[PDB]
Design a protein around this nucleic acid. Structure first.
Lengths: 57, 1112
RNA sequence: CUCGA
DNA sequence: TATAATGGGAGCTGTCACGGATGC
DNA sequence: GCATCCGTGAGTCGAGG
């Protein structure tokens, strides 16, 4: 049952959420990368906040 | 040739300016010709007035705005892919309340797109049209509660995104509830906040039967407006600290704030008319002298109770009535987006006012124009109602400008659109065409403004009627809304008149849409014309009264898809609207005043007017429209010709001497022909090709960029590696194909080289290189070539280079080259033809002339249409047309047959007798008697009861001819068709659906990034989609290997497709397929959701489909 | 979005 | 790195049938 | 045992842009 809670979040292979250069030399990318970046930023900030003894709120 | 016109109905007024719905709306929104101080509080002026002043320097106020001249002309904007627009400046002033200091400045806000003379826009080089949107008018409505019979719902609706919808209901427990933002609460509370006491409410609402008791709550009256206000703020905002000024701010912003709540002027007017009151502004209440003041609530509740009780003079509202649905035109929509952008700008302003030095603030420092420009650009580029202009022909553009959409932003989401919104309401009469609407999912949701209809200043559609007083029809015309129209008895336009007096004692009229027979005494108004019932397109179908509406819809719609031909003709049978369409679409060139033509050229006409001034009119020649059809003007005057005001100077596309020319007049026979015209297919003669009938000019645009890369620059050049002189033959010195060159699929249009990606040569390449001893070049061929199935003659080149005058490309781009390629398209097998009556079909066979059925005089027909296409379609108009055509063929004349006022059978019979005398008398004069074959056909016809037995051959042939039928000989045998055949002239158009643009095939080609499946679309050299249903078909056939092949080797199996291709080129059979890549994708994407998907064997042991590549 | 079947 | 500054601001909503917790 | 709010489906392919 506890497996319904995540401790390690899987990360999809990069080719399935590509960062590719289009005809004009510009870049196109999947939304999954922005979602993942949001996740990673918040997680890292959480680890730092815990490391610096932040309050409860 | 002579034009005879039928009909007795005299139109009192001409059609209004057909694009006025666009032009006047935008002109109203901009107010550009109005000096600033005289501007009304409407449009963008009103937007400014709503945004400013910006408070909390302390104040930033708006004085006025101005629009400058366009930095570039329209044609230049089309060329350089620029937006045709005007600079917008706003005069702002900054005031510090304490210091009293006042700084004033004119700030640049960016540009606003300008509407062209014809009602369209130029956005990034492409012509666009803002389609008008129909929506529910703001106001106060009362509808039957679908759950509780005898109970009603009151709804207060403001402008879109200008306040929430508020509902008033009488609850089963008796209390009167109010719903705002999905929050049900007792209305008594709000009534208390507004400052109503139990006394006032009792004396005001006591008349109704006990309803008022559901309004009586002691706990509400036991508290002053403030406590009630805070109570309401708690009821609407849970969690938010109930501070006084926050409650005041929220409620004011919800009900009283004119910058946030806004019934339209239309909503205000309708609320006033319905509730029998008068509004000071356009909100539901005011904030006056520290307290709130009612405006709409009490009257609405009053009406609701009155209606619930049964008090006379109170009724529910039909929401589909065109008195309750209005049109938002381009001006209003643009103004809305302008308002949004301005709001964002204001937020930015306050944000900057909080920061920075507080003494050194100028208007320029506070104002960032970017969000406004963004909102405008977003509206004109990516809004739903901003559409790529249809300009296949001028009628296309005209119709596109007069379209009305129920969809779009704030509009109806589809599939939530039931039968009601899509219905033809009775009030559509004279306002919205009942015929012209799309087939399929958009039916009833996209419509067309009726020909005489006008949108009024409030947005309601109005139609013209003639005043009738004492059975006498005046020339006084009144434009009415549907609400106004519902008051009168309105006679039909075909009511018999002697002079201006009604001549019948029984006249057909309408009363609230209901047909009724009345006396002339009862007639208050009379229709202007049958024309006013239908759109411009439907008004172009002759004998419309004989066509079933379902096919009329098709002919109507298909006129817009007609292609301009090089030898375009106006129809032999017209409705009489063909000139106004050309004129109003601004296709053709007309004389500005009286004068004499000084110069006539293919490029330009110079006219000397009466003033003595020389005016030069340049002629647009072989220009490319949005759809690639040819836009060119041909001079129709000669040197020294005397012209009057409004006379034709040049014919535009699809114009023949000022008449709308959407196609060709062809001699048709109505008969089966060896299966070649089976199921709507069409047989034509090669003679049509020989004399360039249905030949059309089309121009395609190709484009290529040379940019800077990290590996070296791309460049346009002739020095392309590994190409012969044969391949470079038509390229100029710079590497661009020459003007006049004929290009075919595979041919280079623009030479380009690109530095290769960092190449690690495989050992094979190294060995081969050693064998041939040739250094691999640094650059590779990346040239622009003609795609498969395309080509023609190069007519124009455009080159834009960085570092050159007037030129600045997007960052990194060194140069851009454009090549225009023109083709002359002859009619071919598979091209789509149509008439105005909904008869459509593709050309299935092109017959040599000797194979065509022919008249006894040796004249072959041009087109053979199948009679089986008529009975179940019920579009007999096309038959009548044909008959009249026959007459016109021999009399050398054309006809104007107005809809519902058109030529009748007897007149056509007369014309056919006249034509018969020409058709046969000539023969008898030339010294020839009746033919044996004709005698045979006459015998058969006697058996068919088509001719009276006893008469001479000539008399019988004449009878047949009067039935529109002739003797026809089979070109293959010389024997006559056993029966007489309907033959005559018909107007047929070639539609934009040409097989040349549709034929597409693919062996292998580009695949998708993630799925590794073939791309879609002809442009991407794509593959056909084998969807779920096609799969079902193969499954139902039990075609397991075919299906698996489609699933694997043919799509998304990489090893499989490679091995299959190699096997086929080796002449070996294709190998066994393996795992589709998209299944691996599925597995990985399920793993990303923390699901473990495992492929097992029969022993439940895992099988790796990733071949160890993904297992550590 | 619009068009086509 | 030091005047003092202390709770946001979006929000037009014209369908329908079912499985569901619920919750009246 | 019975009304209430929430989540979810709603034809295909093809074309343009």
């Amino acid at each position: 049952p506890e497996w319904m809670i995540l401790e390690a979040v899987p990360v999809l292979p990069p080719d399935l959420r590509p960062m590719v250069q289009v005809d004009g030399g510009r870049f196109a990318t999947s939304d999954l990368n922005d979602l993942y970046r949001r996740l990673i930023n918040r997680n890292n900030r959480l680890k730092k906040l815990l490391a610096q003894g932040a309050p409860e709120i | 040739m002579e034009i005879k016109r039928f009909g007795r109905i005299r139109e009192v007024i001409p059609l209004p300016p057909l694009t006025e719905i666009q032009v006047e709306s935008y002109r109203r929104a901009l107010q550009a010709d109005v000096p600033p101080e005289k501007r009304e509080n409407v449009g963008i002026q009103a937007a400014f007035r709503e945004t400013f002043p910006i408070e909390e320097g302390l104040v930033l106020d708006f004085l006025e705005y101005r629009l400058g001249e366009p930095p570039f002309p329209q044609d230049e904007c089309r060329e350089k892919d620029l937006t045709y627009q005007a600079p917008l400046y706003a005069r702002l002033q900054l005031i510090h309340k304490d210091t009293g200091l006042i700084k004033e400045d004119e700030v640049f806000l960016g540009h606003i797109p300008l509407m062209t003379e014809d009602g369209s826009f130029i956005i990034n080089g492409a012509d666009r049209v803002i389609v008008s949107q129909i929506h529910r008018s703001p106001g106060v409505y009362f509808t039957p509660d679908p759950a509780r019979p005898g109970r009603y719902i009151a709804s207060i609706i403001p402008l879109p995104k200008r306040g929430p919808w508020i509902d008033l209901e009488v609850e089963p427990n008796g209390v009167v509830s109010m719903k705002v933002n999905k929050r049900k609460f007792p209305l008594v509370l709000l009534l208390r906040v507004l400052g109503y006491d139990q006394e006032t409410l009792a004396r005001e609402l006591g008349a109704y039967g006990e309803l008022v008791q559901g309004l009586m709550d002691e706990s509400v009256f036991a508290m002053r407006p403030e406590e009630a206000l805070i109570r309401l703020f708690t009821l609407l905002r849970p969690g938010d600290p109930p501070k006084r000024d926050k409650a005041v701010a929220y409620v004011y912003g919800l009900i009283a704030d004119p910058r946030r709540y806004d019934l339209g002027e239309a909503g205000r007017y309708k609320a006033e008319e319905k509730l029998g009151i008068r509004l000071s502004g356009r909100t539901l209440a005011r904030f006056e002298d520290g307290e709130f003041k009612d405006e709409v609530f009490l009257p609405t509740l009053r009406y609701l109770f009155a209606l619930t009780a049964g008090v006379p003079g109170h009724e529910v509202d039909d929401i589909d009535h065109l008195g309750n649905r209005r049109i938002r035109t381009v001006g209003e929509l643009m103004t809305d987006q302008f308002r949004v952008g301005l709001a964002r700008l204001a937020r930015g302003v306050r944000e900057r006012m909080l920061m920075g030095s507080e003494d050194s603030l100028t208007p320029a420092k506070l104002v960032n124009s970017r969000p406004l420009e963004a909102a405008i650009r977003e509206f004109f580029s990516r809004s739903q109602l901003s559409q790529f202009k249809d300009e296949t022909n001028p009628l296309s553009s005209l119709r596109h400008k007069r379209r009305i959409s129920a969809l779009g932003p704030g509009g109806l989401t589809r599939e939530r659109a039931g039968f009601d919104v899509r219905d033809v309401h009775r009030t559509h009469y004279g306002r919205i065409c009942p015929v012209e609407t799309p087939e399929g999912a958009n039916i009833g949701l996209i419509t067309s403004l009726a020909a005489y209809a006008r949108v009024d200043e409030l947005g309601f559609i109005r139609t013209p009627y003639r005043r009738v007083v004492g059975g006498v029809v005046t020339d006084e015309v009144v434009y009415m809304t549907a609400t106004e129209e519902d008051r009168y008895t309105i006679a039909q336009a075909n009511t018999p008149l002697e002079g201006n007096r009604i001549a019948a004692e029984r006249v057909v009229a309408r009363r609230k849409g209901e047909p009724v027979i009345v006396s002339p005494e009862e007639v208050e108004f009379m229709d202007v014309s049958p024309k006013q019932v239908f759109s411009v397109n439907t008004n172009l179908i002759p004998f419309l009264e004989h066509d079933d509406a379902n096919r009329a819809l098709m002919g109507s719609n298909m006129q817009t898809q007609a292609v301009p031909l090089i030898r375009a003709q106006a129809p032999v049978v017209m409705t009489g609207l063909e000139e106004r369409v050309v004129r109003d679409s601004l296709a053709a060139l007309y004389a500005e005043e009286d004068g004499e033509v000084a110069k006539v050229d293919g490029n330009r006409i110079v006219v000397r007017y009466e003033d003595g001034r020389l005016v030069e009119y340049p002629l647009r020649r072989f220009y490319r429209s949005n759809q690639g059809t040819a836009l060119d003007q041909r001079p129709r005057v000669v040197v020294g010709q005397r012209v009057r005001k409004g006379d034709l100077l040049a014919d535009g596309p699809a114009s023949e001497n000022g008449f709308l020319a959407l196609g060709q007049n062809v001699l048709v026979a109505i008969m089966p022909f060896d299966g070649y015209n089976f199921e709507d297919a069409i047989v034509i003669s090669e003679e049509l090709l020989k004399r360039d009938f249905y030949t059309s000019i089309h121009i395609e645009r190709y484009e290529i960029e040379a940019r800077d890369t990290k590996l070296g620059p791309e460049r346009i050049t002739r020095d392309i590696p590994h190409l012969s002189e044969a391949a470079l033959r038509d390229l100029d010195e710079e590497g661009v194909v020459r003007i006049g060159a004929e290009v075919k699929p595979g041919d280079i249009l623009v030479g380009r080289t690109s530095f290769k990606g960092e190449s690690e040569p495989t050992p094979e390449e190294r060995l081969l290189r050693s064998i041939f001893g040739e250094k691999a070049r640094d650059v590779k061929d990346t040239s622009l070539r003609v795609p498969p199935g395309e080509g023609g003659i190069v007519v124009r080149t455009v080159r834009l280079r960085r570092g050159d005058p007037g030129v600045e490309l997007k960052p990194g781009v060194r140069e851009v080259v454009r090549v225009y390629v023109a083709q002359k398209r002859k009619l071919q097998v598979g091209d789509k033809l149509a008439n105005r009556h909904g008869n459509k079909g593709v050309v299935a066979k092109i017959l040599p002339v000797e194979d065509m059925p022919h008249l006894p005089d040796g004249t072959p027909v041009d087109v053979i249409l199948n009679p089986l296409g008529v009975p179940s379609r019920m579009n007999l108009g096309q038959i009548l047309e044909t008959h009249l055509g026959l007459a016109g063929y021999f009399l050398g004349q054309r006809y104007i047959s107005p809809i519902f006022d058109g030529a009748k059978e007897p007149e056509i019979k007369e014309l056919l007798a006249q034509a018969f005398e020409v058709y046969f008398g000539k023969r008898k004069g030339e010294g020839f008697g009746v033919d044996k074959r004709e005698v045979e056909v006459l015998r058969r016809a006697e058996k068919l009861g088509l001719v009276t037995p006893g008469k001479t051959p000539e008399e019988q042939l004449k009878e047949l001819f009067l039935q529109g039928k002739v003797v026809l000989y089979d070109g293959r045998t010389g024997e006559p068709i056993e029966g007489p055949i309907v033959v005559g002239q018909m107007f047929i158009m070639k539609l934009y659906h040409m097989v040349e643009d549709k034929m597409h095939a693919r062996s292998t080609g580009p695949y998708s990034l993630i799925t590794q499946q073939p791309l879609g679309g002809k442009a991407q050299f794509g593959g056909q989609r084998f969807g779920e249903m096609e799969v079902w078909a193969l499954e139902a056939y039990g075609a397991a290997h075919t299906l698996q092949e489609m699933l694997t080797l043919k799509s998304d199996d990489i090893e499989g497709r490679n091995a299959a291709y190699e096997a086929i080129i080796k002449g070996e059979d294709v190998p066994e397929p393996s795992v589709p890549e998209s299944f691996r994708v599925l597995v990985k994407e399920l793993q990303a959701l923390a699901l473990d998907v495992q492929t097992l064997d029969e022993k439940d042991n895992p099988v790796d489909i990733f071949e160890g590549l993904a297992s550590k």
